């Protein structure tokens, strides 16, 4: 019977709700008040990455923190040597609409995923000079919205069909499928302990999944709209999501509930992108009002304004040494921020 | 350095290639084909191609002008997040089964028209299966007054263009569905973006022309908005 299991699920959701309430003896906004703020950060543009043809819908940085992959909706994937503003490996795509790109932690591989239901993996460091196809990771019934490379031969891909998928790039078939969500799934991030990832979707619930165990560990229903943005806290023990509701929220992993809200009454525009600069003392939440707002994620106030775009910021990422912030936007440009 | 110099020159090379592909991007006018899994969304593809993949690129060159038209099949029924990938297109071709009763397509049009990112994107609107509409409202088996009570107080407008040999009830019905879409069109986006309602069948070969003659006015309208002339 459908209704008795539905009522059991609602009662168990209430059990999770008052278990989260029972472990919320004092919230993080209450206990972090003696610490001084960072202040008005006059973070500015260092590098303006011009040359993308259409709206830059996603990007990723690297562990070398000098090369960044950027996917814009023209049908071109551009690696950017950010220290010298060089267009490394701009390559024509099978699909004009690419919605995501990741950069391999070693640096060999990138992941063109978009409308085509294909995460085509492209090997940058080939003996060839054209960045040829490793293989097209096909098999999804929804748009590829985010990807994150586990290793050279292993990737998790966020897809717009309620399913994430851990793949196997040496074989081309899905190693495991993460089917717990009810809405199409936008955003992805891997922890420093890379075997444990977290993924946000359009049902206001980001879930923490296991790569090796293969399915869901934790569920977070703290938002109230469609999660475009997710990233771990840089210890791999918490994670922040941003959505369409003009309210970023930071969740824990050792706790099952929300740590903080990030919502200025003046922000009536949603969030597309978040990233972290080796610390949760500073969180970047690219918004829909064409500029990025820096929230101090221990005092929940607007620490900074990145007003350097004439269109919406669709992808913001911090270098893995914390050096820079590249915000690619719908103006076809990435601004690099320090 | 010199590998910094050679990397800057290689990047100049990348751009040289980006400009040669920006010739075939900026002179290419992107179309987003949408429907409600009942219109002639597929047969339009099967007629202007001859003149598990989630996007279909159809490359048709009309009046020696290239057009990439993007059919969204093999995607899920949720729209709101892959629709944001198409706010730099020239047009969204909303194809509607004007004979199938329609309001679901009217809410789809309400969503596309009043999307915060597509509010600069003007919709080419294809009232397709006008032959099925003509064999539906002349038969009288299914009426629109049941599905729309403002059709009872609707009269055909004086700027309407009826076909030679077309029945007045067919013209009144088809322009009522057009005016149903233009209640949405003339509500939020007045001159920012402007709808293009025309009438389509599965037989007419004028569809690529009707796309060209509309996208002409579309990019003229955004060019005039660039001077704020609209």
């Amino acid at each position, epitope marked *: 019977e459908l209704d008795q299991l*539905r009522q059991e699920a*609602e009662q168990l*959701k209430n059990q999770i*709700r008052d278990a989260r309430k029972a472990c919320a003896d004092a919230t993080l906004s209450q206990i972090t008040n003696n610490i001084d703020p960072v202040g008005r950060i006059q973070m500015r543009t260092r590098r303006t990455l011009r040359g993308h043809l259409a709206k830059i819908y996603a990007m990723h940085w690297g562990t070398d923190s000098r090369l960044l992959v950027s996917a814009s909706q023209d049908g071109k994937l551009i690696i950017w040597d950010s220290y010298t503003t060089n267009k490394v490996h701009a390559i024509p795509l099978r699909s004009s609409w690419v919605m995501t790109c990741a950069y391999a932690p070693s640096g060999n591989y990138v992941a063109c995923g978009g409308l085509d239901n294909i995460c085509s993996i492209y090997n940058l460091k080939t003996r060839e000079g054209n960045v040829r196809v490793s293989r097209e990771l096909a098999g999804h019934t929804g748009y590829l919205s985010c990807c994150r490379f586990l290793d050279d031969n292993q990737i998790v891909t966020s897809s717009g069909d*309620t399913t994430c998928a851990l793949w196997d790039i040496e074989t081309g078939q899905q190693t495991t499928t993460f089917t717990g969500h*009810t*809405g199409d799934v936008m955003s992805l991030s891997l922890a420093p302990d890379t075997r444990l990832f977290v993924s946000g*979707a*359009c*049902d*206001a*619930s980001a879930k923490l999944w296991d790569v090796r165990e293969g399915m869901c560990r934790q569920t977070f*229903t*703290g938002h*109230e*709209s*469609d999660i475009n943005a997710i990233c771990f806290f840089p210890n791999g023990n918490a994670f922040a999501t941003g959505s*369409d*509701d*003009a309210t970023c929220r930071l969740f824990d992993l050792r706790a099952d509930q929300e740590l903080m809200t990030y919502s200025h009454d003046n922000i*009536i*525009c*949603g969030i597309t992108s978040v990233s972290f600069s080796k610390s949760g003392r500073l969180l970047l939440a690219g918004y829909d009002d064409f500029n990025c707002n820096v929230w101090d994620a221990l005092k929940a106030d607007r620490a900074g304004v990145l007003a350097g775009h004439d269109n919406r910021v669709s992808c913001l990422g911090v270098t893995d040494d914390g050096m820079a912030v590249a915000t690619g936007s719908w103006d076809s440009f990435l601004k690099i921020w320090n | 350095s010199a590998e910094d110099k050679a990397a800057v020159e290689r990047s100049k090379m990348i751009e040289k290639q980006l400009q040669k592909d920006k010739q075939v991007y900026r002179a290419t006018h992107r179309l987003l084909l949408l429907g409600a899994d009942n219109s002639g969304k597929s047969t339009i593809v099967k007629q202007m191609r001859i003149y598990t993949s989630g996007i279909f690129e159809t490359k048709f060159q009309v009046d020696k002008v290239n057009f990439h038209m993007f059919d969204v099949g093999a995607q*899920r*029924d*949720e*729209r*709101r997040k892959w*629709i944001q990938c198409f706010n730099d297109v020239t047009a969204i071709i909303f194809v509607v089964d004007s004979s199938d009763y329609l*309001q*679901e397509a009217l*809410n*789809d049009f*309400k*969503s*596309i*028209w*009043n*999307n*915060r990112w*597509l509010r600069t994107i003007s919709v080419i609107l294809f009232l397709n299966k006008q032959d099925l509409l003509a064999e539906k409202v002349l038969a009288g088996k299914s009426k629109i007054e*049941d*599905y*729309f*009570p*403002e*059709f009872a107080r609707y009269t055909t407008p004086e700027d309407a263009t009826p076909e030679p040999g077309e029945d007045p009830r067919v013209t009144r019905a088809k322009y009522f569905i057009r005016d149903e879409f233009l209640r949405i069109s003339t509500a*939020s986006g007045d001159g920012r973006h402007y709808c293009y309602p025309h009438f389509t069948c599965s037989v007419d070969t004028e569809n690529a022309r009707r796309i060209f003659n509309d996208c002409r006015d579309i990019i003229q309208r955004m060019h005039l908005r660039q001077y704020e002339l609209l």
Partner: nanobody, 126 residues
């Protein structure tokens, strides 16, 4: 957590009066546009009505354009749907299709077969 508990439905005669409430939890109800969408047997999801964050912008489907009326209280965190007269053909379950984004005038995906922000459904049988 977005939970949309509908109240109402049950066995009534065609033409009777039946308010259709919707207890909304987990979101600021005043900041969101709201929808009502039905699922009839043998059909897909079919939209009923859409109302804005305020009470100004109100739209109906033409099946219920004359016989339905919709109310909304922002302070009570509750969506309403007062049904005046029922036809036989809407013998469905009304899913409160909450709108995907706030402060926006477009309501995508409320008629999807698997959409997130709908209720658990109450069968309005005539």
């Amino acid at each position: 957590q977005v939970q949309l508990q509908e109240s109402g439905g049950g066995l009534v005669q065609p033409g009777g009066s039946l308010r259709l409430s919707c207890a909304a939890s987990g979101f600021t109800f005043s900041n969101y546009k709201m929808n009502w969408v039905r699922q009839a047997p043998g059909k897909g999801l079919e939209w009923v009505s859409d109302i804005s964050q305020s009470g100004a912008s109100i739209s109906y489907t033409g099946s219920v354009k004359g016989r339905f009326t919709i109310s909304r209280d922002n302070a009570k965190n509750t969506l309403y749907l007062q049904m005046n007269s029922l036809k036989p053909e809407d013998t469905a379950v009304y899913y409160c299709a909450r709108c995907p984004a706030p402060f926006t005038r477009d309501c995508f995906d409320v008629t999807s077969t698997t959409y997130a922000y709908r209720g658990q459904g109450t069968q309005v049988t005539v």
